[PDB]
Amino acid sequence: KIVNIGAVLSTRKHEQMFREAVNQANKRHGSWKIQLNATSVTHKPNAIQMALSVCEDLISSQVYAILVSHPPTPNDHFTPTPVSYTAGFYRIPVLGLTTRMSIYSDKSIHLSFLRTVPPYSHQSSVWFEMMRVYNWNHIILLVSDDHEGRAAQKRLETLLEERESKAEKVLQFDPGTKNVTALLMEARELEARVIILSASEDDAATVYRAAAMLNMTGSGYVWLVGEREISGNALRYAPDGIIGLQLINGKNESAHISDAVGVVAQAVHELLEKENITDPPRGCVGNTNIWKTGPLFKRVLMSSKYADGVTGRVEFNEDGDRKFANYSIMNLQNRKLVQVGIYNGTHVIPNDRKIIWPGGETEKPRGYQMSTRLKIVTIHQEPFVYVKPTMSDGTCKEEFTVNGDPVKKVICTGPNDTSPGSPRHTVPQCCYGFCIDLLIKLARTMNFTYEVHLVADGKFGTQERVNNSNKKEWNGMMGELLSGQADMIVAPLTINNERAQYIEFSKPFKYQGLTILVKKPEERITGINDPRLRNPSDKFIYATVKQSSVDIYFRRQVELSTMYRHMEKHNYESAAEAIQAVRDNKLHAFIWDSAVLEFEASQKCDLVTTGELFFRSGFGIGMRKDSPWKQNVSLSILKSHENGFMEDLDKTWVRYQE
């Protein structure tokens, strides 16, 4: 008829308040014969023999609730772990009260640990509530702590699953270093300015000093950290105007202990209304049997419903944390902490105090600086990308067309040849053609400059397993775009299902089908329906570009896998190699798009296309994810579609014949 409560507490005043709350816990519960005894222990400068003394004293005491209430620990590890582990050896709930580490969030590791505080990742949820107020969609994550970094990124992806958006850049590395400045300069080149930081005080002061040396406290920069990053020398290195968080009654020890005693007491008086009430035996000497109502009492703690307390309502969720906590939002006004907001269970209310920013105005900084210099990557398309070496040094020969129009070239940068032939010989030459003048029209339309460069290979890009770690990766223009080295694939890119799963698309500019290049008895093929090409031989040589999207499109078509096993013996790197081989009568057929071969038939009259016109598809501009260059650019493309500018581009190259 007795219940023991164990605690690790040092100060005699909080021990007296703890014993007074234990004595007053049986006040309003009538004249029932239950008794509540309390046992508190102090601290030894070590941690192993502390764990030993506490664990065997609470085994000999047979307590039901174990409390740790020491925020000023001299060790910066903040680990009450071994007492909770020894209680989890017999499945006894330990109620942690001070630390907020996410490693305690794992119920698989911490089988019988509960706490009345949330981890810091929920603060990012509050920062997700910052995404619901100021209409922000691109963040920059920086976490040094690898113990909580995976859980923080998992919670971040869970929160961004509702919007189905992704973070722009995430970083995890070893704490204690000082060169993170190159990563900060790479973050400077990004569009967003949202700085999310999750580390200790040393790494926070290091990145504050690194941002102060780079002078990242200008206009548009978003600064948003927590309570751990505004203490110690990080408070000395703190730039003004920074927006931080504050835990309401997180440091207030006495009311937290009183609320914990109320929660434990009402949980015990709820558990006394049930049967199958087992007791943990003397497990120190000759008793390794587990406490049989471990998960039962844990489920009793799962259904803990409350309506009274000092601060607010307390309830344990599927993770065992405190919900609906009130937070404070502080601002650093000239190295002075000024409160600028309050936070309810789910809602933010800024007060009448102004929001002073480190940059310019007091309104929200529109920190999405879009790319005004687009790194344009392209592949060498023969009717679209005409590449010519310069005359003397970086100049373009302004040749005139037959319509009185000078050719508007561009200084592109490209290699000589492929990697076995020419490994690294990249020069700036002059590029012009269809998509070059299309990009010139886009630059005339919108507010941007650009940077035209080429791709290192002659391939679009296919998904293939890299030989280490058994992972499928990309290459080509998709491999260079997703690496961040490029900005916009301006190329006749093959639109299919697999590419749209990873990036976003625009409206297609080119619309054409598929055909067969032959040379001119039926010398023609009449498309795919030739029965001699269904079961091929060494006579009719049909082939395609190596690592092309037509190969993937025919790889999905499992009913013509024999053509998949036939073109693999004759895969060519570029289409110009196929033109050179079919002019010298080494090839016999070539699956390729319609209008390119029609232009080559206008070049050379012996080139003949086939009769069947299948897979009438469209080619557009390769794009990034959700970006401010999506809606404006698609409206500009549609404006180019509605007028006769497509006919003008036909008059440049397509409609003209030779």
Binding site: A500, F505, K507, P508, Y511, G618, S634, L635, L638, E642
Partner: protein, 105 residues
């Protein structure tokens, strides 16, 4: 597939009847294959306002008036795409290549 059509009796009253009719064709097959793949529930009906869409003093009509004013969810049927229609709603990717032409003898 069945659908309804609100056919009015006269011009004297605004009262009409929802006559149920059958439909087939291209977009019907597209919608049936979308219901096969996505496995959702659809609410198919017809518009009685008129043609595709035309703004008369910030008032759209037809399917544009049904979608922009949120009396429906999406327009599966045939619809031309220009600038202001792409401004008011979000089109999907194009699937069929349908331009304009001139019929002569």
């Amino acid at each position: 597939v069945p659908c309804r059509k609100f056919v009015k009796i006269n011009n004297s009253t605004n009262e009409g009847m929802n006559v149920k009719k059958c439909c087939k064709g291209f977009c019907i097959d597209i919608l049936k294959k979308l219901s096969r793949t996505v496995k959702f529930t659809y609410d198919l009906y017809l518009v009685t306002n008129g043609k595709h869409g035309k703004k008369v003093n910030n008032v759209w009509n037809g399917m544009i008036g049904e979608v922009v004013y949120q009396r429906a969810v999406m327009a599966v049927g045939s619809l031309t795409i220009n600038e202001e229609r792409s401004e008011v709603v979000d089109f999907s990717v194009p699937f069929v290549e349908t331009g304009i032409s001139v019929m002569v003898s």
